[PDB]
Amino acid sequence: EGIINPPIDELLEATDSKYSLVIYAAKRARQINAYYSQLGEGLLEYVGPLVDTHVHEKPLSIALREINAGLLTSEAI
């Protein structure tokens, strides 16, 4: 429980290396935080969270949980 959840080994099965996982999780966390901030105002493209949350949970933790569960995909642009 805490900062060691989910385990890094399980997370790395969904990406190529730690460096890409960092950006993947950070982008998802920014999306979640933006969704929360502008939730009340007019609807926007942002979606999520896609998993059960807590009262005031860090968006990065939710992003990591979503990545581990396999509810996200990363493309190349």
């Binding site: 950006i23 993947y24 982008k27 998802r28 509810l71 996200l72 995909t73 493309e75 642009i77």
Partner: peptide, 14 residues
């Protein structure tokens, strides 16, 4: 230079 977006299957569940 990635683009993160939920999968189609994941969106329907919620």
């Amino acid at each position: 230079n990635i683009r993160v977006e939920p999968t189609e299957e994941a969106k329907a569940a919620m």
